[PDB]
Amino acid sequence: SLPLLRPFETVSLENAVEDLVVRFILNVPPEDLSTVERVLFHFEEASWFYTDFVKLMNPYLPNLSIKSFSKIVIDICPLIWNWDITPENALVKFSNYKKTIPVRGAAIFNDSLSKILLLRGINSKHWSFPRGKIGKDEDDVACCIREVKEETGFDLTGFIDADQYVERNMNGKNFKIFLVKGVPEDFEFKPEHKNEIQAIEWKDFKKLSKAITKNEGFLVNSMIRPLSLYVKNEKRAKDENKLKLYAEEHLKSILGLNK
Amino acid sequence: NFKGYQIEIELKDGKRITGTLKQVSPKSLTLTDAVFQDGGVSPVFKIKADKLYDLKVLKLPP
Amino acid sequence: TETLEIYRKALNFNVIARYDPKIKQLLFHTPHATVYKWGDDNWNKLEYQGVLAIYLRDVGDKEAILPEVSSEANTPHVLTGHDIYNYGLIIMNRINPDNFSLAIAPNSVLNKRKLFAPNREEELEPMKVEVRDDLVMIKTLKKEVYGIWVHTPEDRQNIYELIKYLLENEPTD
Numbered sequence: 001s002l003p004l005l006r007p008f009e010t011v012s013l014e015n016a017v018e019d020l021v022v023r024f025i026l027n028v029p030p031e032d033l034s035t036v037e038r039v040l041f042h043f044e045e046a047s048w049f050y051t052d053f054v055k056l057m058n059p060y061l062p063n064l065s066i067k068s069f070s071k072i073v074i075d076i077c078p079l080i081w082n083w084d085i086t087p088e089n090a091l092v093k094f095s096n097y098k099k100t101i102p103v104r105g106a107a108i109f110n111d112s113l114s115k116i117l118l119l120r121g122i123n124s125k126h127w128s129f130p131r132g133k134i135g136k137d138e139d140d141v142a143c144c145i146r147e148v149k150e151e152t153g154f155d156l157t158g159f160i161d162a163d164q165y166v167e168r169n170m171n172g173k174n175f176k177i178f179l180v181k182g183v184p185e186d187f188e189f190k191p192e193h194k195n196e197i198q199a200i201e202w203k204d205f206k207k208l209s210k211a212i213t214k215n216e217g218f219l220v221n222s223m224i225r226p227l228s229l230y231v232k233n234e235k236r237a238k239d240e241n242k243l244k245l246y247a248e249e250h251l252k253s254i255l256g257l258n259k
Numbered sequence: 260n261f262k263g264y265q266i267e268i269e270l271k272d273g274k275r276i277t278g279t280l281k282q283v284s285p286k287s288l289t290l291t292d293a294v295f296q297d298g299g300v301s302p303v304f305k306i307k308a309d310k311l312y313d314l315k316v317l318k319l320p321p
Numbered sequence: 322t323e324t325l326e327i328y329r330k331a332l333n334f335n336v337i338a339r340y341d342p343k344i345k346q347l348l349f350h351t352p353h354a355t356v357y358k359w360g361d362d363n364w365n366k367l368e369y370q371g372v373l374a375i376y377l378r379d380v381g382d383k384e385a386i387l388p389e390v391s392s393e394a395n396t397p398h399v400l401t402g403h404d405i406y407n408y409g410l411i412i413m414n415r416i417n418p419d420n421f422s423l424a425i426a427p428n429s430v431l432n433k434r435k436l437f438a439p440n441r442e443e444e445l446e447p448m449k450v451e452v453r454d455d456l457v458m459i460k461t462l463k464k465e466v467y468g469i470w471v472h473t474p475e476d477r478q479n480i481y482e483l484i485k486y487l488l489e490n491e492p493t494d
């Protein structure tokens with residue numbers, strides 16, 4: 001209701017920082033101040049906000065990589081950097097730190113089950129699954145839903161089976177990928193965050209097996225047989241149901257006093 | 260035709276009868292190894308279309 | 322020591338002061354919130370997540386006016402007219418650049434304004450606050466129902482009582 005002035009079209013990189021600092025870093029609970037790795041997650045959000053909106057409206061403003069940005073952020077507010085560690089060394093700690101945070105994703109399949117939904121990220125060329133690193137104190141299924149909505153604009157809630165996942169450990173990173181069936185293919189899967197996902201498409205399941213079996217160059221190259229088995233166990237069940245359905249659909253009319 | 264399909268028959272009196280189908284006719288339904296929710300198992304059940312209420316097709320044949 | 326918090330106090334002020342230039346004094350700040358809004362007899366998620374802050378707003382001048390931002394129910398109706406709104410609310414949106422605002426005018430000096438000077442532009446509906454379903458339910462001056470979420474129950478019931486203490490106790494100093 002109360003009307004506020006947009007101070008971000010024409011703004012000093014100096015006052016843009018002071019702003020962003022209050023938005024992200026400066027005003028957070030001291031539990032996310034425990035590690036240097038903790039605080040650098042805000043610096044990562046703030047930098048993604050800067051380059052998502054601030055630099056958008058301000059052509060003149062620099063282009064800031066987390067390196068330069070976080071390094072500038074301290075220059076303006078030295079009272080925010082408590083510890084005697086350089087944000088250079090602290091940021092390489094953070095990058096290596098990320099490499100341990102376990103990913104939780106999803107295997108998005110349609111009712112038909114012939115096709116699987118896979119996404120590719122901006123920098124890369126490899127197709128994989130909608131997936132992301134867990135947050136602070138959030139259950140495996142909730143992190144999957146948060147991360148799949150952020151990546152595909154789909155709230156998976158309904159189809160999230162908890163005991164039906166695929167777990168794999170690729171280079172000290174735990175992947176737990178849930179198996180989802182019944183997703184509508186017609187819906188537009190646009191991602192919700194800028195500069196994260198390049199392309200999202202429905203690759204045909206059979207096509208992939210045939211190309212994976214050739215060994216060329218995807219988490220799908222390890223969870224191949226589990227995924228195929230799941231499909232097999234699902235087509236088997238969904239069709240067995242349409243055989244029982246027709247057996248019923250004929251009984252409830254060959255005798256059946258259907259209403 | 261519909262032989263082997265294990266079906267379940269619910270009745271409005273308060274009884275339920277499971278068992279595998281043996282003969283399908285629009286006037287009569289016959290079941291092999293009919294188990295009743297009253298504690299009765301019979302190997303041969305014959306019931307008419309009129310004395311029937313609800314139906315579900317429990318299992319398909321092997 | 323505390324210099325790390327005096328700065329935090331000044332910077333928290335001066336930054337909000339650029340979105341709302343009429344901040345006489347900041348009341349407080351809780352670092353987690355999410356706006357929800359009552360639509361189809363249900364609560365829907367809104368794109369405002371970030372630090373909640375209630376502040377005292379300078380009110381002020383005889384003819385101070387509230388200007389308009391440069392650009393169906395989904396949108397909150399902008400507050401147009403004179404500056405009477407004694408206190409304000411802001412959620413420093415970590416999502417997108419625009420921030421959440423609720424003008425909190427006391428239900429005491431609301432009727433005082435609209436009946437002495439019966440010149441009514443908008444119909445200020447005396448704001449209501451309650452707590453239900455882990456949400457601080459806020460009925461707004463323009464009939465809309467906004468509910469905000471804090472993780473801490475102490476925080477959820479502290480902002481509530483204060484919001485009441487503002488709309489109930491008259492604005493004096």
Ligand SMILES: C[n+]1cn([C@@H]2O[C@H](COP(=O)(O)OP(=O)(O)O)[C@@H](O)[C@H]2O)c2nc(N)[nH]c(=O)c21
Binds near residue numbers: 132
């Ligand atoms: C949400 N976010 C993600 N990134 C990009 O996505 C990459 C992965 O970042 P991540 O969020 O830590 O991984 P997750 O998606 O597996 O959880 C980063 O290196 C950035 O390239 C982002 N890049 C920009 N510019 N803006 C954003 O809002 C944004």
Ligand SMILES: [Mg+2]
Binds near residue numbers: 130132133
């Ligand atoms: Mg990811």
Ligand SMILES: [Mg+2]
Binds near residue numbers: 150151
């Ligand atoms: Mg992601």
Ligand SMILES: [Mg+2]
Binds near residue numbers: 132133
């Ligand atoms: Mg993440």
